Design a protein around this ligand. Structure first.
Ligand SMILES: [Cl-]
Length: 88
């Protein structure tokens, strides 16, 4: 149940993992709940960053590993994603 993984900090990762470490599902990068935020789909570099009309894990800001925005009990926060490192 793992079958792609990310190299380095996952900045080049473009798979379809959409769950965080707590088992919550990612919000879409084009969600209306994210108006105000920098790392959405309306970012001018969304294209290059892989932020689009989807809720797949991305690392567009140079963080540790792929992450996404989530809701933890109706609160908007973000979280690292459950993608295995290719180094395990
Ligand atoms: Cl952001």
């Amino acid at each position: 149940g793992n079958s792609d993984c990310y190299f380095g900090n996952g900045s080049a990762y473009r798979g379809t993992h959409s769950l965080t470490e707590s088992g919550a599902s990612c919000l879409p990068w084009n969600s209306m709940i994210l108006i105000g935020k920098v790392y959405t789909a309306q970012n001018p570099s969304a294209q290059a960053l892989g932020l689009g009309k989807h809720n797949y894990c991305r690392n567009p800001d140079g963080d540790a590993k792929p992450w996404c925005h989530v809701l933890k009990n109706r609160r908007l926060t973000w979280e690292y994603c459950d993608v295995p490192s290719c180094s395990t």
